[PDB]
């Protein structure tokens, strides 16, 4: 699996360029994955991923929460990995068929695909969570080996972790801002999310080195 | 939202020459173009622009909108900023997220699309079984634009009788995907058509075949 360095993933969606290379060069010492998604994206362009592969020692997990048809995923997938991601997160909800075209496409190109089973935000709750578990059976039963869990709901972070095994990697959003706690979320998730706690804050080393501390046992 | 031939063009090739070529080939035949990944993350999100430039189309973003509140508001945002007209939003994530997209396009005077069961074989796994819950979830929240599945005509019709007829309804899966110009177009306002016209030796022909099965509509 991938080695995370401090178990600390960087989600940056600032939307201004010379604001996220900013800040992702000032925590560059404490973290080597960033999460880039569409924020940012759809702001700067797929050259972005380039840009920070430039700048920094840094993987890129890109989080475009892929969940279209299968052929439209495809050609997703393919035009992310071009621009230089590591991997990619793919939404589960869409069924089967959509996370194989994914996984069809990493497998081909030498690279990884996260999938998304529950999120965590409260919306959540309405359709998601209900098709959680069995999202999540269907990624272990397709071969997918790294997830995304909420950081918001600890017994459901639990039971996904139970589902994949403890040899799959699962990372988890909705630390900080959204009210998970960092060692909690470590229990059971690899490595956590962090990105408004960081990013926003006036000195994000600071930031960073404040949650790297809270876990220093972990 | 006033469709011309009520055939909205999936232009999902990811070559800007080829994107624009074959969009000009068929500008007669449509005044609005839906533009989504494929294509905006191989050439940049100036494509939106650059296809108002040369056909005041109408351009409406497949986006699939499909994370949380404060993500999703961004997303619209930076699409809207690009010039998109509407934007397609997935309702499985919730309320919430929908509301958050409905916010910003409020703000900038555009439109959300709730897309509510898809028109892949897979949609059958988890969306199907939540999407007359979603429908009407967008009926709750005020939603008034929808996308339902061509592949699965009873489903579209179920969507049409929760929405009523006062809302907009479009549908992709027309050609590649099985489903029918004619019969979708029972239920939606207008039907949206990728590959069949797009990867066609001459979609120009193309076009105008589907349009010509479709005359008396
Ligand atoms: O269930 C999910 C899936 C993805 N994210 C993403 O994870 C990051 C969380 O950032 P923040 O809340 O620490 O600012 C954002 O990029 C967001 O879009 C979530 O928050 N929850
Ligand atoms: O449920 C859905 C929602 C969106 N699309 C999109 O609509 C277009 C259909 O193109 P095609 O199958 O006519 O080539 C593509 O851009 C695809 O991503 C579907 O096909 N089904």
């Known amino acids: 699996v991938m080695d995370v ?30 999460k880039i998604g569409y924020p940012l994206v759809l702001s700067e362009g797929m050259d972005i991923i380039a840009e920070f592969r430039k700048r920094f020692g840094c993987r890129i997990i890109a989080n475009f929460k892929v969940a279209d048809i299968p052929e ?13 991601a590591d991997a990619i997160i793919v939404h589960g909800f869409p069924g089967a068929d959509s996370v194989r075209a994914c996984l069809n496409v990493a497998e081909e190109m030498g690279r990884e695909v996260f999938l998304l089973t529950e999120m965590s935000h409260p919306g959540a709750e309405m359709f998601i969570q209900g098709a959680a578990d069995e999202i999540a059976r269907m990624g272990v039963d397709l071969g997918v080996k790294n997830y995304v869990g909420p950081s918001t709901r600890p017994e459901r972070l639990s039971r996904l972790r139970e589902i ?21 979320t470590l229990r059971f998730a690899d490595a956590i999310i962090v990105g408004r706690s960081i990013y926003l804050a006036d000195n994000p080393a600071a930031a960073a080195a404040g949650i790297i501390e809270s876990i220093k046992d972990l």
């Open 164 to 184: 994949i095994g403890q040899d799959s990697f699962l990372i988890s959003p909705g630390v900080g801002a959204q009210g998970g706690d960092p060692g909690e």
């Open 72 to 84: 439209t995923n495809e050609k997703i997938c393919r035009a992310t990995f071009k621009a230089g």
């Open 5 to 34: 360095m401090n178990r600390l993933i960087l989600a940056m969606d600032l939307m201004n360029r010379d604001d996220a290379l900013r800040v992702t060069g000032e925590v560059r010492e404490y973290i080597d994955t960033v």
